[PDB]
Amino acid sequence: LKCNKLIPLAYKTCPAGKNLCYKMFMVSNKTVPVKRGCIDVCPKNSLLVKYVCCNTDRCN
Numbered sequence: 329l330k331c332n333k334l335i336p337l338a339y340k341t342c343p344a345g346k347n348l349c350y351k352m353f354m355v356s357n358k359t360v361p362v363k364r365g366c367i368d369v370c371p372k373n374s375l376l377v378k379y380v381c382c383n384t385d386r387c388n
Contacts, residue, residue, distance in 0.1 A: 331366055332386045339386060342366030351388040353378040364388050 329342045331349035342348070345368050352363035355376045370381035382388055 329366070329383070330385055331364060331382075331388055334361070334364055340365075348381050348383060349387050350379060350381045353380065361388070 329347050330339050332339050346366035348367045350367035351361050354362045371379040
């Protein structure tokens with residue numbers, strides 16, 4: 329699987345163990361991403377930090 333980068337055009341393939349995409353959002357702006365990469369297991373959303381995972385290409 330492949331996920332987009334922070335700067336909306338670049339991308340990177342998920343290493344071994346990582347076949348899912350994830351995005352780190354901060355309450356400061358749940359409408360804007362702070363971090364993005366690959367993940368093996370989706371975390372749990374928080375009241376402050378929001379973690380979203382996708383199983384699609386260039387989802388995030």
